[PDB]
C-alpha cells in the first residue's frame, strides 16, 4: 500500500536533482550513491541534519521524465571509491567529489505530463518539473509528486523506516 510511503514522507524535505545523462542515474540506482556540485552539496548536508527525511527526486536532462526518488542516508563523504561518473563537458571529478549514500524509495519513471497540475511555491509556482539542480520543492507539492509515481513493489520500506 501507500501507508509506509506516507510515513517516510511525513515532514520530509524534497529536492530536485537534475542529471545530464542517464548513465549517472543508472549508476546511482545500482550503487546507492549520488554526487552533486559544491553549492548543492552544501545545501543537502544542511538539509540532512534538519529533517527526518531528505528526498531527492531525479530527472535526466531532456528526458521529459522523472526517473525515481530516494532518501539521503548520510551526509556527503570523501576519499572512498572514486565513482565512475560520466562527466559532462567542463566538469571534473574533483567537482563531483563528495559522495552521499541514498536509499531508493522508487526506481520507476514518471512523465512530466503527469505532474502538470503540481506547482512549486519555492520556484514562483512554476510546474514542479521546472527547476535547477538542487531546487527545493515545498512539502505539500513534493509529497503529492512522490505519490504520483507508480508503486515500486521491489522495495520494502521497512528497512528505510528503521533508519529514521
Ligand atoms: C553525478 N552527478 C551529476 N551527474 C551529471 Cl551527468 N549531471 C549533474 C550532476 N549533478 C548535477 N548535474 C547537473 C549539472 C551538470 C554540469 C553543470 C551544472 C549542472 N546543474 S543544472 C544546470 O541544474 O542541471
Amino acid at each position: 500500500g501507500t501507508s509506509k510511503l506516507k510515513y517516510v514522507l511525513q515532514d520530509a524535505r524534497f529536492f530536485l536533482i537534475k542529471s545530464n545523462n542517464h548513465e549517472n542515474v543508472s549508476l546511482a540506482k545500482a550503487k546507492g550513491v549520488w554526487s552533486t556540485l559544491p553549492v548543492n552539496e552544501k545545501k543537502l548536508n544542511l538539509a540532512f541534519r534538519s529533517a527526518r527525511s531528505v528526498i531527492l527526486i531525479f530527472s535526466v536532462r531532456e528526458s521529459g521524465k522523472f526517473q525515481g526518488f530516494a532518501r539521503l542516508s548520510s551526509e556527503s563523504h570523501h576519499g572512498g571509491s572514486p565513482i565512475h561518473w560520466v562527466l559532462p563537458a567542463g566538469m571534473s571529478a574533483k567537482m563531483l567529489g563528495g559522495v552521499f549514500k541514498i536509499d531508493w524509495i522508487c526506481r520507476r519513471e514518471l512523465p512530466f505530463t503527469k505532474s502538470a497540475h503540481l506547482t512549486n511555491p519555492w520556484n514562483e509556482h512554476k510546474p514542479v518539473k521546472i527547476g535547477r539542480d538542487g531546487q527545493e520543492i515545498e512539502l505539500e507539492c513534493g509529497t503529492q509528486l512522490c505519490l504520483l509515481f507508480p508503486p515500486d513493489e521491489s522495495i520494502d520500506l521497512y528497512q528505510v523506516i528503521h533508519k529514521m
Side-chain angles (χ1 to χ4, degrees), residues 1-30 32-41 43-51 53-60 63-80 82-90 93 95-113 115-131 133-139 141-164:
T2 164
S3 297
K4 285 202 287 286
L5 171 60
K6 289 161 132 87
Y7 182 81
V8 172
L9 298 185
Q10 168 215 124
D11 300 306
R13 288 178 77 180
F14 302 81
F15 297 91
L16 180 64
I17 296 300
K18 290 280 169 85
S19 178
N20 282 213
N21 56 63
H22 282 283
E23 282 67 34
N24 294 349
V25 173
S26 296
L27 200 39
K29 283 181 181 181
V33 292
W34 190 248
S35 297
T36 188
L37 304 202
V39 50
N40 299 321
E41 181 185 359
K43 295 187 17 162
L44 290 180
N45 282 326
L46 278 169
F48 183 83
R49 312 160 193 150
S50 83
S53 292
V54 176
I55 304 291
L56 304 191
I57 309 173
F58 286 80
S59 176
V60 175
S63 71
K65 300 173 190 174
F66 301 100
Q67 281 74 34
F69 62 100
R71 179 181 179 284
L72 289 187
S73 59
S74 74
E75 289 180 55
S76 77
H77 284 126
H78 293 250
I83 287 101
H84 303 275
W85 303 117
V86 163
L87 301 184
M95 296 197 251
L96 287 180
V99 173
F100 299 85
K101 276 130 117 166
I102 60 176
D103 284 323
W104 287 89
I105 298 170
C106 180
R107 294 176 161 98
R108 302 283 303 272
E109 67 149 56
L110 182 80
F112 287 169
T113 50
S115 62
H117 65 287
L118 299 174
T119 59
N120 185 0
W122 299 149
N123 195 26
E124 301 175 351
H125 287 95
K126 291 167 182 188
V128 67
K129 79 185 170 185
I130 303 296
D133 184 59
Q135 168 70 54
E136 186 158 8
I137 303 170
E138 176 270 339
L139 168 72
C141 177
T143 299
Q144 290 320 296
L145 179 55
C146 288
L147 294 176
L148 290 175
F149 281 78
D152 190 345
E153 300 150 13
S154 76
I155 297 179
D156 190 341
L157 290 191
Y158 177 82
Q159 289 74 6
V160 160
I161 286 187
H162 275 24
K163 311 190 157 65
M164 275 142 236

